[PDB]
Amino acid sequence: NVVVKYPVNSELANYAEKFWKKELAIYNLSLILNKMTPFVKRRSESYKSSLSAVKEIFKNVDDFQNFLNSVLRRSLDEYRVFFENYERLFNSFSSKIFSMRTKSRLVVGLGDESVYETSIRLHRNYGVPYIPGSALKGVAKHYAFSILARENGDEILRIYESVKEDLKARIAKRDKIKKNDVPEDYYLTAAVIQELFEKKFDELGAIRNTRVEIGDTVISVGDIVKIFGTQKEEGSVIFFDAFPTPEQLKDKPNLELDIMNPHYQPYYQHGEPPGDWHSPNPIFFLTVPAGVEFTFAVASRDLDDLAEKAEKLLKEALKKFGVGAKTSLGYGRFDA
Amino acid sequence: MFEKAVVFGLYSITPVHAGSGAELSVIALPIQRERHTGFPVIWGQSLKGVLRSRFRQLELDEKIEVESQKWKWKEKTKEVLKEKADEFIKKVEERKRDPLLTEIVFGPATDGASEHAGAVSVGDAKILLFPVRSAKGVFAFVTSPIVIQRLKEDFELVSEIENDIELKQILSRFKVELSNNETIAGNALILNGENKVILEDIVLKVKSDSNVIENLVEVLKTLFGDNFFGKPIESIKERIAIVSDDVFKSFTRFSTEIVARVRIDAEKGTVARGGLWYEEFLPSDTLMYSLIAVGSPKKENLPKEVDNTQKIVNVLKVTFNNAFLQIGGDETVGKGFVKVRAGVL
Amino acid sequence: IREIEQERASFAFKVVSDIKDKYSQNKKVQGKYSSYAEKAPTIILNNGLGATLAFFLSKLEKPIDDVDYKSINPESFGNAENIAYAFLYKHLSTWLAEGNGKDSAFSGLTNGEDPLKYIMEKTAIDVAISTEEALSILNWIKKFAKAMLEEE
RNA sequence: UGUAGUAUGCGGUCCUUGCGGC
Residues in domain CRISPR type III-associated protein (chain B) (predicted)? Predict the structure, then answer.
């Protein structure tokens, strides 16, 4: 009762429809997802090319998830050799490697622009979910920022009154008028700490003697800035991408669906009173389920002690801060 | 002029961003490419720079194995330049001058260039196989007639340098010509029950030919041994496709990785004002071949272990075989890591 | 010696000035148009040009395979998102199918056919060149939109 | 002419009941 169309060129739409009808066997998940996106028309006169409308061509959500995971599993041998080479690359450097399972659902790259409006970070060649190293480095840096703000908030605020005044003036300039309201909350401390770590690293020389307790170890501010680097000095810790272990993909699914059902969406966007006359607009998106095991590795360029400190910081961040998208809802959390 | 030539093969384990810095298209920070063709290449300057940095690190760490014997640069410099051995060492201690072996091979450091020229000359990392997604055979290694023609020209140059005509005709038995909708693909990529292939956006009729693909596989095997960067070479002979020139150009221009990155400000937890940018990356599992020519060293009073050109050839081959290097930017976030294999004819 | 860069810049300036003048009051329309313009190249590089055009048409609540750019009015939509999507689709398709004009240096790769229907039954090389031209014109349009149009 | 790595610093984030009624 649904009409499927394909905006790809002719002589290829037939093969795309064969792939989506399971008549043929596709092997690359990113290929079928992106380059062969179907446009589904329901009783409503509109070819909505969204996962909510894309799933309508299957029997149910379970069938869609099973099809996606079978397509993912069809490249298991290639992913296995790729992971073996990746582990060899890890061991080539003096990299410390640790494995972590997903405590809750994880979704990285949800904000990427795509036809589905809700994308997911999939490896181009093999079509498996992965965490880019940039995300890990950023989450570690932000966890360090949060720890510093929570512990040494008033101290750094007093030491850098000029910087906090500059930040308050900037906020007043952009955030409405707010001439001097500018509450000195934890968020302002985090902002000025980030500003110090990004544009005012040299002025952070005095603070470098400070130490903050992470997990069981103690990390200095100088250690953190050496690990991450500045505009004038390169970081010393190499953060590699994280990939799931190939073994677990054989038995449990590595990709599932999740739903967002925004009732009162006009209230949030347009300003209508919430009430209850606000029929929802469900939107589905892919996410790797909880329990999937990922392998992380951090290497060093100058000192292995910095690598160990960065590994501890990243473990703490993944345990508490969380990586990926919708981290405010407990998504993308890892457990030992 | 030159004496010998080795072939360096680079297999991109992670996406590689050899930055160019020339303007900014919609995909910001474009990679360096050949202007007239658009094919992605790594210029000799960057490859020589990273090789020189790795060699300097190895020599300072005292890990370079010459003739299966460890190389200590201090005692060698003393045996060569005993009059000023201390002073030159101070320059290395102050980073003014690079260590002895790197200065012999890659030339003297920037602080002084008129003394001698480099004994080595790297080449541009011309692409050989491109990873393109496929319906069957999850991803495929793709090549173009210009690619194999340039490989044959490179082989001819190697034969001329070494005066070895025997290796000249290794690839000289491969002439091809393909329409824009035809390809010579391995059995894995070919669709079941249909003599057609799909390379990430296109349905291509499978042209029937075996000598060309067999010769290409044999050439790769001769260049890089029987181990093709962690997997046997014979295991990928059925995942190779030779496509039309325009199709290969389109693959190299549009199938490259486009990575979006943002900066998260702690004041709000959202992307900052203009904190987002896109970067172009070479896809993972790509092959780039380069020529490294070597002649007589231009220095004076050389040690006996590096006296002749072959003593440099073997040292470079043993020190840069199945190694891992970082090319381009985003080193700190695990980008640009490549497996390097050195071969000779 | 008439470079296509001049035609690209002139067309982008004309279209961005047109949307700025026609909807100077609607700041949210300007913001939506700017966001769609600076996000379109990512969609084109990800899912292709035909998929992007079909996505715009779907966001316009219009059928595919039976709609051309000449038969859509960008101002005939109540919603700001629909307004911006229609304007972007019209501008991109107009540049692809006619260029800056018949007498200009660039007359569009497609003669006069609808770019989506052109993509449907053309070779991969033609759609690749069309994608390259669309990328360039979208880059210019995003540049000019960031220049003049207000930010959402 | 010789010597020379477009590199370092940046989280695709923020916002949303799988519901309403028998």
Answer: 12-339
